Amino acid sequence: ISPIFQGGSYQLNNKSIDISSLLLDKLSGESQTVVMKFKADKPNSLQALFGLSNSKAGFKNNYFSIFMRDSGEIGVEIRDAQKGINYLFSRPASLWGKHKGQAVENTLVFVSDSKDKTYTMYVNGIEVFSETVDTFLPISNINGIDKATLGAVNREGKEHYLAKGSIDEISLFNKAISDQEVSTIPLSNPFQLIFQSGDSTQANYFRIPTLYTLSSGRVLSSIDARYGGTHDSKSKINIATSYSDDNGKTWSEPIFAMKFNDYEEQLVYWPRDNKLKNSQISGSASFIDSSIVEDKKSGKTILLADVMPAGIGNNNANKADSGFKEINGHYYLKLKKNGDNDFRYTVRENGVVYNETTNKPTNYTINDKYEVLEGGKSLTVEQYSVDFDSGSLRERHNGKQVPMNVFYKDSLFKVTPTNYIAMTTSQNRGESWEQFKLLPPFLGEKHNGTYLCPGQGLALKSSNRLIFATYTSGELTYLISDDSGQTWKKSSASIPFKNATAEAQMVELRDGVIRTFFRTTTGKIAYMTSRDSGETWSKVSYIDGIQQTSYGTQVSAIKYSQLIDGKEAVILSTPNSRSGRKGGQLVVGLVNKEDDSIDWKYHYDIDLPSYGYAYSAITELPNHHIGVLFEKYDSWSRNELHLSNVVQYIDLEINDLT
Known part of the structure; x- marks a missing residue:
């Protein structure tokens, strides 16, 4: 059907725009759809994009609002004091702010459906909530509505929740448009999805993205397909993979690299309320934290992951x-x-x-x-x-x-x-995966397995050597193979941390010279260097200019193939924040040929300082673009558990970063 109201190019500069005379007498019936294309790259802490209110004295809590927070959260309020109704529905990490220096046009679709008594919100093609209530409140049935407002809610004659941003397009319909109809609405997304709710994995959640560029030109990704919400093991988690043969433009339907069938592959909407959100699948076996490398000699792709027996995770694993x-x-x-x-x-x-x-x-x-x-x-x-x-x-x-x-x-x-490590191989670059095999212990009979560092293994350029970083108490434990992953040996590198999650990723600065960047407990990313292809390792140093939280976050890192400003370059991917897992950056470092030091010269902001960015994967695409697959949310926050379709993929060029 045609819109009842359509307006465009509204600038929200901390001053509401009154659309009462255009919209209010046009609203009729109990079902409505709002379609809104908007930008907000400098939002206020909490701001209303759209409001329908009773603006009269004594009715300050009689309104409908579509609001957002500077955390990237989107939501609605539907309130009527006489009816005793105060609905608040929202989801964290629902928005984009900026991409390649430009404000992102978000596409918001809110369906208020009286027949099904359900309120559904979509942002950028993704359903972020769908809430069924027993007593439905039609958005224009709020007692005494007399204002329609953009960029605020008029409460008792005054502008509340003033917005900074713009609405290029807003449309309203006196119908609840169907999900099929929603999917036909054009989008201007800066990102794509490789893995997503409803795909072949049937996992409703994903975490721990990886990327690796294969010699054929194929780009491969692995991930935790997490079924029991976004919880670490104990849970049900499988390792899923997907590949692109066109520089990341399109991705294959996911398959499993490692899976257990003790529990069904169920797409479950995990509770997010404070009573139930910590619910964890407690009887399933799982895989967690995958890493990928390619072997030159054999042409095999090799994937490792941790394996957890039924009911087991880090917290209850036999030490x-x-x-x-x-x-x-x-x-x-x-x-x-x-x-x-x-x-x-x-x-x-x-x-x-x-x-x-x-x-x-x-x-x-x-x-x-x-x-x-x-x-x-x-x-x-x-x-x-x-x-x-x-x-x-x-x-x-x-x-x-x-x-x-x-x-x-x-x-x-x-x-x-207890925890184990397993490896699988593919002889067809990710079209199928062989049955996994457990790795033997490396630190003795009475030492539990090390924890694999998610992301990439290292394939040394001028030899057959393969290295996977792992961590345990007191050290990084590098696993080294010179025979296509048939046998492994360890190389221990002491770190000055007890019981730390020292997720480590490696770059080859020059032939046989490896720098490892790793997560710590100090609020700084650390590094160490090997000058003998991983046989021995330096003491630990720290990067200045990048901040992490006390608990830290995984850092991804690559050695870029092309010179930048006439110098060899390394690229790091990490949140840059001392507060949370937000403010994602790609940091470009130029290697000094004199001493292998690195000048961190460019810091590229993935999106707003306040928008979420946790675990990440980066790879140089065959065409020299940069592919980034990342958790676009705070995966530590107990307020941002169990969000769907937040692991997202973007394409960048070096000129964007510099």
Whole structure:
């Protein structure tokens, strides 16, 4: 249908624009849609973009408003004091401010549907909330409405929530437009989605993006496909991948690199209220924190990730246990059988489950997929599903039989409840992934596994050496392979931190010279250098000019292939803030050939200082553009949990950064 009101190019300069005589007598019926294209690159802390109010004395709480915060949050209020209704619906991190030095035109679509008693908000094509109420309040049915306002709400004759920004286009309809119709509305998005709600993964949430440019020109991405909201393990999380063959313009439908089937792949709207938001899937196995590298010699793509058994994460993982038994120099995965209080079993050669107490092989084997067989016959478990139908999280059997895996809750034989690292390989550059295999322990039998640094591995330019950074208490633990990931050795580098999340990413400054940039607990990004291809490592130094929070955030880093200002260049990606995970920047550093020092010469603001930016992935696209896939929200904030479609992709050129 045609709009009932359409207006454009309104400047919001801390002075409301009254549209009462154009709109108010045009509003009719109980369902309305607002379509608004607007910019706000210097917003006030809290500002109303659009308002319908009773502006009369004594009715200050009789209004409808579409508001935003300088955090990037969008929301609505629908209030009527007589009816006793005060709805507030909102979602953090819903907006863009700036891209490539220019204000972003956001496209907002708000549907107020009286038939379904539901209020739905879309920003930039993404549904940010959809709220069903038992008592519907039509937006123009508020008692005594007499003002329609842009850039404020008129309360008792005065301008409240004054806005700074502009509305290039605003339209209103006396209909609740359908989701199909919404999807036809043109967008001017500065970003794309690689992974997204409703795709092949059926995860409603994503975190921990990676990117890597392959020799074919294909660009590969991996990610945590997180099902139980945005929580770290314990949860249900799979590792998903997607690739682009056109310099990031389009991306393949995601597939899994690593997955468990003990719990169903469920698209769940995780509760965000203060009572229920900490609900965590507690009986599922999971993967977490992936990293990718390409091997020159074999042409294989290699992907590593942490593996967590059922119910396990960092918080409850058995410390002082690798989950392996050393027997004359060899490591064998330990197993506990149901009924036993101790781990009496190991997985020997050819998957033979061996009883250590009686020194006899059993009639059980573990196959390549870590599944339990008895006399060659595949054993099964019943899959679980999750729901909030009863008012709290429930995890229950769903009738479906799946192969019994030693990482599962219901398995007859169980692994040590601790963290592991696994690797998978692709021989077709991410079109399919081989079954993963656990990595052996590197710091001994009674030391739990190290934690993989998400992002990229390092493939040294002038050799066959592959390196994945990991971290543990007191050190970075580099995993080095010279034979296409068939065998790994460790290289330990002490850091002056106990129990820190020292997420580390590497660049090769010149042949065999590696600089590692890493997250710390000091509010500063740290670095160390190896001048012997990762064999030995320097003491720790810190970068000035970039701020992080006390808890820190992952930093991504690349060595750019082209000279900038006649010098070799390194690019870092990180939030630059001492307050939160916001103020994302790409920082361009020029290497001094005299001493390998770096002049951090250019700081490119991804978006506003106040808009969210957490974990990130950067890669040089084959055409020398920069691809950035990043968490566009504060992934630490307990106020910004369980947001959909916040991991976003952008394309930048060097001239944008400098």
